[PDB]
Design a protein around this ligand. Structure first.
Ligand code: BCL
Ligand code: IRM
Ligand code: IRM
Ligand code: IRM
Ligand code: IRM
Ligand code: IRM
Ligand code: IRM
Ligand code: IRM
Ligand code: IRM
Ligand code: IRM
Ligand code: LMT
Ligand code: LDA
Ligand code: LDA
Ligand code: LDA
Ligand code: LDA
Ligand code: LDA
Ligand code: LDA
Ligand code: LDA
Ligand code: LDA
Ligand code: LDA
Lengths: 41, 48, 48, 48, 48, 41, 48, 41, 48, 41, 41, 48, 41, 48, 41, 41, 48, 41
């Protein structure tokens, strides 16, 4: 069900930390793609 | 990160599966698009 | 910006996922359309 | 503009998302149709 | 025009969106069919 | 929900007037297509 | 015409839209089939 | 909802009259197709 | 004809539309299959 | 809803008579196809 | 849920004003397409 | 034939239509597969 | 709805007899296919 | 075989049809894949 | 569920600010596309 | 509906025995495919 | 492994079938992608 | 239904052990693919 304003902010910290973890892994994968692939080369 | 009130309006039991499923579908579509429009990704799959 | 009474008629728990999902699908369709009808976007994906 | 009693019969929480979604799908289908049956819209996307 | 008792059996909140949506889908299918099987409708879209 | 017999007949007049308005616009569009297109020519 | 007890078993609010929708879909499929397998129906659409 | 046996027979007369009206229009359209088209010719 | 107890287990309001709809879809698929794999059915549609 | 055992047998007679009527029309259509078509010829 | 007759007319004014705003933007886009494109030229 | 307790866990009003529908879809897919990958089944459909 | 253990076993006898009847018809159809077709020949 | 607590969390009336249906769909997809990428399976279907 | 008129206006400010943030990022992406791509060149 | 822990373990024995029976039939079908087909040959 | 509070927000009876089904669909899509873009996987299927 | 915080952590251990078991089998399959296939060779 929909949350209290405080419970919503507590849940959204896990969503934002999950998106930051995904972003970091994607930044390493894009650097590996720049180094190992003819992309941007 | 300033959008944290959205779970007062959207049910997180529907919206969090929709978010994770949309991200996973998007990653498959990008991989398929790169596979179909380059020669180097099929050549990496082929080897030899 | 003058349409703000629409959430008295449309449930925001259905309509806000539909809005964000429609925008994301549209962005994928535009990217696919540009990839399939230009030589420079496949050439940027290819490199070398 | 004389059809304003229709929301006594059709639920506006279903019908107003269906209207806006149908208009958006139609606009994408018309854009795709023009892209696939002209040389000038792919040439505008290509440039150079 | 003699079928006016049909809303005693069919819910108009389901059937009236189904009617309008079916008419709109049919008009798109006819336009697409004419676009794909004539040279003059693609030539009108092309111009020049 | 499903209607009374009288309410059904009142609703169907708007459905029939809407279909007659659609028919008239389509008859003008078909005449314009006959005049401006190689169809039937 | 001897099948008139079927509305004691099938809900007419579901079955009558299904009947009319199936007939309309069938008519579109037959028209498309004739358009795709003859030269005279595309030639009638083309004119000139 | 599902109907009484008598109400079902009353509804099915409109379904059968609608199918007979559709059949008649289709018989005129098939005759017009026989006359105006290379079909069966 | 010995299977007549099946309506004690399957709801006939769901199962009888599913039966009639499956038979109608099968007949369309067989007609399409014969149209796409013979020359005489397209030639009958063509005439002349 | 699901039926009594007796009501189920009464309904299934109409389903079996409907399938026998469909079978008979299909047997005439297959004979007409044998006579008018290059199939089996 | 479905509305009162008065509430329906109040809602439909926003639907008609939204469609008029869409029509106006589409009329500017069609004029820009006439001016910048080989369409009708 | 030793699996007869499955109707204590699966609703037979859902599972028995799913079984019969899956068998019918499979038979159509096998017929289509044989039609598309042999010359003798299209030649039997053609005759002459 | 889901059945008693005894009612489930009674229903499954009809499912197994239906599958055995389908198997027998399919065994005749495969023999007819072996005899009339270039398959396995 | 150590996963036997999963029916305390997943409804077996949904999950057991999903399991059996997924296995059947997978077997059809593998058969189709082998039919479309070998010459010996179409040649076995053809005979002669 | 559907909102009060005041709650609807409060929610729509976040929808409009989200659309303005999306528009701004898209305006930077279109300028970068104009600068780095053969589009309009 | 979802089961007791003991009822879940009783059901999962039938799921595991069904998967072992499927595995055995598939192992015979793969051996027959190795023997009768150009696969691995 | 630090995300273990997610079953307080997402129903595990929906989310655990969605997880297992998404993993199985992804594995089929990867196998199909490798089959369609290499010569060695079709050659392994062919043999001889 | 959604779980208690303690019940959620107990369930997630089985999800994480299942993903670790899948990862290990996939690591053996990727090593077998490296050894038996022209991939990376
Ligand atoms: C015609 C008699 C009635 C009427 C009868 C009906 C009926 C009946 C219905 C509607 C419906 C609708 N009406 Mg109306 N309606 C009327 C007047 C209006 C006016 C107005 C005058 O301001 C507006 C804004 C609307 C708006 C609407 C929409 C909200 C809705 C969907 C229409 C649709 O899909 O049309 C598509 C468009 C057309 C058919 C018109 C053709 C195109 C127009 C004329 C020109 C486009 C020009 C283009 C931009 C440029 C091309 C240039 C080229 C060189 C040619 N109506 C008049 C008073 N209306 C429907 C509904 O309620 O849906 C839920 C519905 O069933
Ligand atoms: C070529 C073409 C066509 C297109 C090309 C490309 C294209 C368009 C690309 C577009 C890409 C886009 C848009 C990518 C976007 C990616 C994004 C946004 C990723 C987001 C990831 C988010 C994650 C991973 C979230 C995890 C959340 C998590 C794990 C949440 C956990 C929550 C918990 C535990 C509940 C705790 C509650 C309690 C109360 C108990 O504390
Ligand atoms: C080439 C190929 C393949 C195929 C080719 C072609 C092919 C097959 C074509 C087939 C075409 C067909 C079949 C076309 C049919 C078109 C039809 C039927 C159009 C009908 C339009 C109906 C309308 C617009 C109705 C509007 C109703 C309305 C607005 C109703 C309003 C109601 C209100 C306000 C409620 C008041 C209640 C209160 C109690 C308050 O008074
Ligand atoms: C080439 C290939 C692939 C295939 C080729 C071809 C192919 C397979 C073709 C197959 C074609 C087939 C099968 C066609 C079948 C067509 C049929 C059956 C048409 C039926 C039309 C029925 C209608 C229009 C019914 C209207 C009912 C109506 C209007 C009912 C009104 C009811 C009311 C007012 C309620 C009153 C209640 C109260 C208690 C108040 O009195
Ligand atoms: C080339 C390829 C790919 C494939 C090729 C071919 C291929 C695979 C073909 C397969 C074909 C198959 C399998 C065909 C099967 C056809 C069948 C089974 C047809 C059955 C028709 C049944 C009917 C019409 C039933 C009507 C029932 C009716 C009307 C029931 C009425 C009931 C009433 C009135 C309720 C009374 C209740 C009260 C308590 C009041 O008395
Ligand atoms: C080439 C081919 C194949 C095909 C080619 C082409 C083809 C067929 C084209 C067909 C095109 C067609 C048909 C186009 C039709 C377009 C239409 C009709 C557009 C309509 C737009 C409507 C809008 C934008 C409505 C906004 C409503 C709004 C914002 C409503 C707001 C409501 C509020 C705030 C509630 C207040 C309540 C309170 C009680 C609180 O006051
Ligand atoms: C080339 C490629 C891609 C693929 C190629 C091939 C490929 C993969 C093929 C795979 C094929 C497969 C797997 C086929 C499987 C076929 C099967 C399993 C058929 C089963 C048929 C079952 C039937 C007909 C059941 C009828 C049940 C019935 C009638 C039940 C009646 C019940 C009643 C009356 C209720 C009584 C209750 C009361 C309490 C009143 O007594
Ligand atoms: C080539 C072809 C075929 C086609 C080509 C192109 C083509 C057609 C393109 C068409 C493109 C179109 C139409 C694009 C439209 C884009 C739009 C409109 C973007 C909108 C973005 C909106 C956003 C991002 C909204 C975020 C809302 C948010 C984040 C809302 C947050 C809400 C909260 C936190 C609740 C607070 C409540 C409390 C009571 C607690 O305060
Ligand atoms: C080339 C490409 C693209 C891809 C290529 C290949 C590819 C990816 C392949 C992947 C293949 C995979 C993954 C295959 C997996 C196969 C599996 C897992 C099979 C499992 C079979 C399970 C069965 C049959 C279960 C039967 C259960 C049963 C019968 C249960 C009965 C229960 C009862 C009676 C209830 C008792 C309750 C009471 C309380 C009363 O005792
Ligand atoms: C080329 C292209 C286009 C794309 C290419 C590639 C591409 C994109 C690949 C992407 C791949 C990805 C993302 C793969 C991800 C794989 C993952 C995450 C696998 C996860 C597996 C998880 C499992 C197996 C979980 C089992 C859970 C289990 C069994 C849980 C059991 C629970 C129980 C028993 C309940 C106990 C409760 C009680 C309270 C009773 O204790
Ligand atoms: C639990 C999951 C288990 C996953 C197992 C993963 C390992 C799978 C191993 C498959 C082995 C395939 O092995 C592969 O076979 C093909 C066909 O014979 C060979 O293919 C070779 O000849 C063919 C032509 O015939 C050429 O198109 C190809 O370029 C060439 O490499 C490869 O050189 C060989 O490496
Ligand atoms: C990208 C598509 C992903 C689809 C995700 C679908 C999530 C559905 C969640 C339903 C939740 C139902 N319930 C009863 C637990 O609230
Ligand atoms: C572009 C497609 C996006 C699909 C979005 C679907 C949203 C469904 C929301 C259901 C909400 C249900 N509930 C019970 C929480 O009100
Ligand atoms: C063009 C397709 C657009 C799809 C729009 C779907 C709208 C569904 C609205 C459901 C409303 C549900 N509820 C409980 C709030 O009344
Ligand atoms: C051509 C397809 C058009 C689809 C139209 C779908 C209409 C669904 C209406 C649902 C009405 C629900 N409710 C609760 C208001 O009665
Ligand atoms: C050919 C497809 C046609 C689809 C027709 C779908 C009709 C759905 C009717 C739902 C009726 C719901 N209700 C609540 C009014 O009983
Ligand atoms: C071949 C596909 C045919 C689809 C048939 C679908 C029938 C749905 C019947 C729903 C009946 C609902 N209700 C409430 C009247 O029991
Ligand atoms: C191969 C696909 C076959 C689809 C079969 C679908 C069966 C749905 C049965 C719904 C039963 C509903 N009810 C209310 C009678 O329990
Ligand atoms: C591979 C797809 C298989 C689809 C299987 C769908 C199973 C649906 C089961 C619904 C059960 C409903 N009910 C009311 C008996 O709990
Ligand atoms: C990759 C697609 C997988 C689809 C999985 C669908 C799971 C649906 C679960 C419904 C659970 C319903 N219920 C009543 C037991 O809570």
């Amino acid at each position: 069900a929909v949350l209290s304003p405080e419970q919503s902010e507590e849940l959204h910290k896990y969503v934002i930390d999950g998106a930051r973890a995904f972003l970091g892994i994607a930044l390493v994968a894009h650097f590996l793609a720049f180094s190992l692939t003819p992309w941007l080369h | 990160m300033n959008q944290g009130k959205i779970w007062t309006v959207v049910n997180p039991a529907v919206g969090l599966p929709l978010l994770l499923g949309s991200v996973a579908i998007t990653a498959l579509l990008v991989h398929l698009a790169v596979l179909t429009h380059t020669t180097w990704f099929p050549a990496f799959q082929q080897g030899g």
